[PDB]
């Protein structure tokens, strides 16, 4: 939080391996997190900024499918500009697209 303090406001540790890609959705408030364990998660955030209040964050659901190869899982991901669709890549020479 660039307005609260230098240190992170909150930290997550549910990931079982190194986190490789984290990006913000261009339109929606959701942000995705992926790691080498082949697990992808998406969190909703209360981006409200009309008042001096911290944003509330909630998990949505777990995602998987990027089998770990050579200990490497999800390599990179990117959010769709306008809809809650996520593109993911992995070490298995395969990429997966997730939709509602």
């Amino acid at each position: 939080d660039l307005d609260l303090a230098s240190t992170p406001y909150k930290t997550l540790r549910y990931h079982e391996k190194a986190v490789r890609s984290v990006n913000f959705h261009k339109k929606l408030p959701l942000f995705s997190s992926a790691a080498d364990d082949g697990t992808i998660h998406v969190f909703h955030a209360t981006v409200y900024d009309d008042m001096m209040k911290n944003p509330m964050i909630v998990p949505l659901k777990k995602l998987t499918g990027h089998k770990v190869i050579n200990s490497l899982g999800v390599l990179d991901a990117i959010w769709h500009p306008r809809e809650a669709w996520l593109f993911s890549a992995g070490a298995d020479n395969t990429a997966r697209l997730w939709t509602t």
Binding site: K17, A18, D36, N70, S71, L72
Partner: peptide, 12 residues
């Protein structure tokens, strides 16, 4: 050589 300089294979 491949394992070096690329996580998380270092942990494994």
């Amino acid at each position: 050589t491949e394992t070096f300089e690329q996580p998380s294979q270092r942990e494994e």
